Amino acid sequence: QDDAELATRAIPELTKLLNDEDQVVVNKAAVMVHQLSKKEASRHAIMRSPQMVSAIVRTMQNTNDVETARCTAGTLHNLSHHREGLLAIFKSGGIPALVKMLGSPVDSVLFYAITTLHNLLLHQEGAKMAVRLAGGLQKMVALLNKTNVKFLAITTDCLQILAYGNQESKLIILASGGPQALVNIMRTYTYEKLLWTTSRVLKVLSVCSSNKPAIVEAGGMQALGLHLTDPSQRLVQNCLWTLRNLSDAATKQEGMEGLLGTLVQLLGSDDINVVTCAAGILSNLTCNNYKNKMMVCQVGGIEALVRTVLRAGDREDITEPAICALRHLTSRHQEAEMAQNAVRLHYGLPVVVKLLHPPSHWPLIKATVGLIRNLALCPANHAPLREQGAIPRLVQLLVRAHQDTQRRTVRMEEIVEGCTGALHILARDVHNRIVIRGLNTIPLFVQLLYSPIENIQRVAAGVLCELAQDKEAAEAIEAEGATAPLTELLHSRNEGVATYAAAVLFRMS
Amino acid sequence: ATRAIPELTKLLNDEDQVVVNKAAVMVHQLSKKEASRHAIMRSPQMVSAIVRTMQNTNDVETARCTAGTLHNLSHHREGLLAIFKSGGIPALVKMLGSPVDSVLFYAITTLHNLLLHQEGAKMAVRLAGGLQKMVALLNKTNVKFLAITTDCLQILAYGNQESKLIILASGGPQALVNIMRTYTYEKLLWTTSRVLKVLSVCSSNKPAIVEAGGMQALGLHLTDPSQRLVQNCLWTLRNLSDAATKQEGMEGLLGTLVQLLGSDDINVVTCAAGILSNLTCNNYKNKMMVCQVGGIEALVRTVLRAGDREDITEPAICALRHLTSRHQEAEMAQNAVRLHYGLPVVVKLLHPPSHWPLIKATVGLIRNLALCPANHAPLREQGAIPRLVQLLVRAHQDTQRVRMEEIVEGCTGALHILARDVHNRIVIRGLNTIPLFVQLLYSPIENIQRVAAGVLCELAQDKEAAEAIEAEGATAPLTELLHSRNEGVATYAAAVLFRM
Amino acid sequence: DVAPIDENLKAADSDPTAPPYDSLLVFDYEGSGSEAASLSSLYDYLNEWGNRFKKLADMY
Amino acid sequence: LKAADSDPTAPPYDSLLVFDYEGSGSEAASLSSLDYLNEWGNRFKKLADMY
Ligand SMILES: [Cl-]
Ligand SMILES: [Cl-]
Ligand SMILES: [Cl-]
Ligand SMILES: [Cl-]
Ligand SMILES: [Cl-]
Ligand SMILES: [Cl-]
Ligand SMILES: [Cl-]
Ligand SMILES: [Cl-]
Ligand SMILES: [Zn+2]
Ligand SMILES: [Zn+2]
């Protein structure tokens, strides 16, 4: 109580001294002020004097004396621990001044500056905007060339705070070469706090369409994959969210073998967010990349994805990408046939067929239909799929989707194409054909021969083709009036549809 | 006393300085007593002797005694007259160079009394070169001394441009701003703020005061308990505001100003509004900061409270117009105005008793507010369109018989933006505006041709409207405008044609 | 979605460019931005300072 | 056309209001304030006589 009282007349007095034109006086006052800022009572008198804080700030950014620059920046850092200190700093032009001190050749000054700014960025309203306007972004990205990891942790977090929800900042960070610098940090250092603060910046940048390609080009996928089994769950989860955001743009990368293997193992995690991300990342990385498909199947990806689906239940945020990954893994690569069989061996057929029913929504249903189309390529799955009731439900989905397309005023055309395509493959089996026909499907299939969509015509012709290999069926198709529309599909620019059209015609005699 | 005066006078004029010194001492002591004091001041030869002795002695004791004597006479009407008549001013000014404080203090105080009550003192001090000397004394540190010196400058500068220029030439602005950043003595800050206020109406001192960091320096006192200090800082700030788009480190000032908008003192709100309007004029950084700290809501509340007080609403509306365009957070501001219930009152300001300057500002605000789709319907529901049209027709008529040319441009530009909404187009057309817009295509003013072609472009996207545009004969002037040197005009004219 | 009589028919059933196509899912989870509040950290002499500091030197 | 509506160089423009309040010029009337003729020569004897 007597210290605070003393502080009240010492502050106005030191304010006069800081404003003196004699640098010797200035420098000496800076020292006392710094020392006073270390004690609460006097620190309070400092933060509560607009002229005192303005003098500290001005002295700091204008002195040519290292000790003064250190003492003033240290005073400001000390004031930043309190709400009123943070406010006074902001109101006294401290932000532009602190951003300038980031260029200081003196570590101690630079450290005081970045730390004071971090406190402002965290707790002072208006500080994020002020730093962006003062060119703080470009300077912080440039400082990523430093090697003190604690310094780097604070600096990367400053960039995270500034970039979050702010597209402009993200573009500037990209402009300054931020992605390459941040990926380099992830590849190099082992300090957990820095790996974590850095992964959050990458996470924030990964949602921006311009930053994704850059991060991926800088080798970000592989670097993030290096920390997926770290004991720090916050580091792992952040690397996972980032990897998932970047994944749709990394389907052409190499050196992904380790990453893919680790993701397959993470599918067995008891952490919902770990599993969700792993499934999503894997779905995207297996899209049109036969090397990744081979890798994922090789390490037991199929069994892991099926278990993921079984454990997931009706959680579509897990099942949709898991089912999409399984679809990608059951076609167009050396081990697709083995993959189609593995789904059955690990009890995936019943759940796969189950996913065609409510509460499943259209996105999931579409992916599931696609997977079934691929699974049906394996003869050993024909009977199991039938026994599970795939045919009745696919037919039902097809009927409903078709009727919706026929109304004037996920697109249902896709459901029509998919369901008919699945029935097409399933029709390769004699017993399935009986069931198919038994559902009064022939009339609908013929009607689809008139579809304006080529892909639809193809699958319509395809299933009729398979069905027509049985005489009683072929005759039924002919009676239904398929000849005319079939005859017309011979002049299609799609030799596939033409081939099937020819076949149905041929078989009908 | 009367009897001694003639004696002491001769002793003062004695060439033997030792004698002079002794004389000066008695005269000093004598000036302390009122009875003898009046005797001294009524003797012209005596005062004149005191004046000469003061500037010529080489004895501090004598210098102090003589200056002190003059100071004592300055407390009386007849004393000031005597000093003035015996040429004390030029002598007192010279004493402002003294290395001895007692002498300096006596001199500046005597000059202050003269400046305050002696008719004719100001002109004399100016000639003697007092201004540059007083300015140079502003680096002293005794605050009571600084209080008096700056008050002398205030007296000399008030309503005297010449004196303000000399203060400027002498480096007055930087020295005055330094006082504002350095001391807490309220009388000094107040006396200094008044000099700054006086200088701030000078077009040459303004830039200098701003460059010395005056805006921020004055901002340091906006929450001082001294209301006179606060208001003088605000008047000065407002005067300087049109010349400060270059300053940085303005966050504190802007934040405080936004807060002072909530004040109960009308002078304070008025100034805050004025300062903000000018500080946001073409400065994206200040626009951003003002939005961040809650300026939109504060400015909307200001308009809501103001009623028909145009001294408050005009700069508030202008500030809002600035804030709702040309900066990253303009979208936010446009939305913010609606959120804080600003649309109704804004549209209302387009009506009587609002005068043209306010109406013009309001039309511009509405124009920017319509850039936000979410404001299209509510602006319509407030009756913005028919009133904008009425103001347009009225102004256009006055141009075929604030300049109405500006109202024609503004209203048409607002309509151009409002027309981005299909329902708003219906309303605009329903007021039979197409004929007028086509006529504007003939305006000699490029900007008017632009918004005319713009709104017609928006309207031409609907069948009925296009056909109506054609039936007006728009084709002729539009094809012509295809050659316009103005890119906007030519682009819009082409679009209308195409759409038709 | 992202794209890649008997004998001739076999060429049809074995065409790679036929649906279903593999597809991408564009995720863009930015997180919540929690605070990193646990990062690690980075007057007798007045009597000998002269007249300018007398006032202070006295009170302290 | 998108460029035209984008054109930041086109109106409306921001504008300044010219203030120049010098005040009235009040007065600071409250600023704070800032027998031996014997030992003396024969020159100051007359004074010592009348005093
Ligand atoms: Cl901010
Ligand atoms: Cl980069
Ligand atoms: Cl399990
Ligand atoms: Cl003037
Ligand atoms: Cl100056
Ligand atoms: Cl003071
Ligand atoms: Cl931490
Ligand atoms: Cl006063
Ligand atoms: Zn220090
Ligand atoms: Zn004396």
UniProtKB/Swiss-Prot annotation, chain A:
Residues found modified as Phosphotyrosine: 189, 191
Superkingdom as given in the UniProt entry: Eukaryota
Residues bearing PTM Phosphoserine: 49, 104
GO molecular function: alpha-catenin binding; cadherin binding; chromatin binding; disordered domain specific binding; DNA-binding transcription factor binding; enzyme binding; histone methyltransferase binding; I-SMAD binding
Region entry Interaction with BCL9, spans: 14-36
Tissues where this protein is expressed: Expressed in cerebellar granule neurons (at protein level). Expressed in the intestinal epithelium (at protein level). Abundantly expressed in the tooth, skin, lung, kidney, eye and brain with weak expression in the liver and heart.
Modified residue annotations for S-nitrosocysteine: 465
PTM field: Phosphorylated by NEK2. EGF stimulates tyrosine phosphorylation. Phosphorylation on Ser-49 and Ser-104 by CDK5. Phosphorylation by CDK2 regulates insulin internalization.
Transmembrane segments: none
Cell location: Cytoplasm; Nucleus; Cytoplasm, Cytoskeleton; Cell junction, Adherens junction
Alphabetical keyword list: Acetylation, Activator, Cell adhesion, Cell junction, Cell membrane, Cell projection, Cytoplasm, Cytoskeleton, Glycoprotein, Membrane, Neurogenesis, Nucleus, Phosphoprotein, Repeat, S-nitrosylation, Synapse, Transcription, Transcription regulation, Ubl conjugation, Wnt signaling pathway
Reported consequences of knocking out the gene: Sympathetic ganglia-specific conditional knockout mice lead to a reduction in sympathetic ganglia size and in progenitor cell number, but does not alter sympathetic innervation of peripheral target organs.
ARM repeats mapped onto the chain: 9-49, 51-92, 93-134, 135-176, 177-218, 219-247, 258-299, 300-342, 347-388, 389-417, 440-482, 483-509
Acetylation keyword on record: yes
GO CC annotations on file: adherens junction; apical junction complex; apical part of cell; apicolateral plasma membrane; basolateral plasma membrane; beta-catenin destruction complex; beta-catenin-ICAT complex; beta-catenin-TCF complex
Family stated for the protein in its record: Belongs to the beta-catenin family.
Name of protein: Catenin beta-1
Taxonomic placement: Eukaryota, Metazoa, Chordata, Craniata, Vertebrata
Covered residues, full protein: 143 to 663 of 781
UniProtKB/Swiss-Prot annotation, chain C:
Domain of life per record: Eukaryota
Required for binding alpha, beta and gamma catenins: region residues: 5-60
Residues found modified as Phosphoserine: 32, 34, 40
Source species: Mus musculus
Stated name of the protein: E-Cad/CTF3
Residues of the full protein shown: 788 to 878 of 884
UniProtKB/Swiss-Prot annotation, chain D:
Coiled coil: none
Residue numbers spanned by region Required for binding alpha, beta and gamma catenins: 1-51
PTM-bearing positions, type Phosphoserine: 24, 26, 32
Name of the protein in its database record: E-Cad/CTF3
Source species of the chain: Mus musculus
Upper classification of the organism: Eukaryota, Metazoa, Chordata, Craniata, Vertebrata
Name of the encoding gene: Cdh1
Full-length numbering of the shown residues: 817 to 878 of 884
